Design a protein around this ligand. Sequence first.
Ligand code: NI
Ligand code: NI
Lengths: 168, 168, 168, 168
Amino acid sequence: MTLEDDLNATNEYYRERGIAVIHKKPTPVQIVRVDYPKRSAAVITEAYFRQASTTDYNGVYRGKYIDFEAKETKNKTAFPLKNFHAHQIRHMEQVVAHGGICFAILRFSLLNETYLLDASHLIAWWNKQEAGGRKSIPKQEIERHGHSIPLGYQPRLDYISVVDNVYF
Amino acid sequence: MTLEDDLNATNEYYRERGIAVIHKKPTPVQIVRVDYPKRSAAVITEAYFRQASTTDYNGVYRGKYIDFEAKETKNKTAFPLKNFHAHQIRHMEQVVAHGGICFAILRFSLLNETYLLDASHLIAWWNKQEAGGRKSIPKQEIERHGHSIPLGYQPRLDYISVVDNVYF
Amino acid sequence: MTLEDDLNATNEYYRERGIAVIHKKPTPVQIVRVDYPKRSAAVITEAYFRQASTTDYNGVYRGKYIDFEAKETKNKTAFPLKNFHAHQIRHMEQVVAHGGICFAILRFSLLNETYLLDASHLIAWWNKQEAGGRKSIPKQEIERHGHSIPLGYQPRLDYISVVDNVYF
Amino acid sequence: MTLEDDLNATNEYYRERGIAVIHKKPTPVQIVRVDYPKRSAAVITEAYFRQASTTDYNGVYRGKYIDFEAKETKNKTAFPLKNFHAHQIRHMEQVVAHGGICFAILRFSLLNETYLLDASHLIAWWNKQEAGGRKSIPKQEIERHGHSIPLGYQPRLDYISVVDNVYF
Ligand code: NI
Ligand code: NI
């Protein structure tokens, strides 16, 4: 069970219970060729994968825009920043600036530890890497600036309960 | 150009100017077949459109979740309700219940007339088809209950100005 | 007592005290047969119930149109959606689009608990049934997005104090 | 082509076109005995006509409570106040006090002249009758204090267009 799997089930749990309306953004593709047979499915015959200009999850919760990225590592001491891309980091900056609720869910998959971290800490650590600093955020930095997410069932990853305390 | 083109330019404009962070969602695609060519990039050679479970645009403006659907018609007297799909309408109802700002941008492309119609109106009309009901929204409904969007350049379609007037 | 009786006493209290002018709509009745006796008043001897085209309560409070459906259940965990009829959910959708204040009063009669739930939530839940959404609103949703109504006397069910806090 | 007939067709047209949500209150009847046969309609076996405590039509237009009574007279020079009842007048007083839009639709059937008359005037004349005054309002007073509703095609009696001018 990957983080993505745990998030798909969590987001569905939340939607089914009326707790929050959060979807994973569909994989982005540029469709070039398609044909349209009379009474059967349109078929894409030529399309390319594009780069996402935005993070992977968004939706609404108590009238607010929620926006996040979710990543997991096998590393035991630090979260590597290679998982993140510049476009995503710049998108997040724009969301925070406009009053969105924006964060990363970070899983240390060998320690069974999941954290919510506000985008501002992530943006900062990314800009330090840009300026030539570390290429991974120390785990104790995440524990201190982020929020442990208890992992159970219904939901598997109860991040909205963290969002409730941190942002409202 | 198309409403989708004009909205792309408009969303770009708002992002660049620090006005609003709004993006089109990618059409969901079921990939069936990918090929790996001579020098160039990977090509999806067969793929299908999945039914979308949300509306096409979302993001954040002045701290609020903003969500909307954009449709155009060549009809001159009414907006056909078959332009909107069951799953899009359900998403809209859910967004409204969760305190989000949700509306439709409707274009009579033959008339050069674009309106913003709050979701509540689209929900009522669409849901009313059931008991016979109209299969379209008369243009008069859209003029009396909706809001004309001034077309131009920078932005192409200034919906945010109308949103300021309606929802704030 | 029944919710209907408590709402009758409550509305009469609101009218006598100059707070709100709210009335129950009489049950629509197809009259088939009528007897005329000696001294006695005319009697309806055969009649049928019609499908209701609206919700059962409406009126005016502080310049606003107020419209509501009141239902009760003996269920302990969820409110059954079958208690609401298509024509009433339609009506609510239209009232909301027309700028009215529209909600549901939900009583769990075995628990002695009464909640106000805005129409937007009932519309999202009820319309979600269609694809295979559940057939009841979990009480958790009603607790999360609805508003407990104080019960006592003068009035029996003080829903106008909740209306004031939610809509004004 | 009776006033009730014309109002029925008009009210339905308004609903169909998304103009207003206005219905006639159903006939009040006290339901005493009913049978609930096994898989068949419920049958009211004993019931009585009760006195209506409110006026006949109400609903929502543009966020406002609309409430009216519709009466016609064969008299050619005055409208008899006998068509009105104290309890309706008291209800109209309470609607006005609480910010409702309340009026009467008065038709001279032999003249084909229909007037919207604000509840204020009806209340004033009624209370004069009560102090031992005229039991009928001269048609020239209804002309000067009322607002003419011409007969049309769609709808028959376009009272909402008079409502929009008088109250908005
Ligand atoms: Ni409308
Ligand atoms: Ni809800």
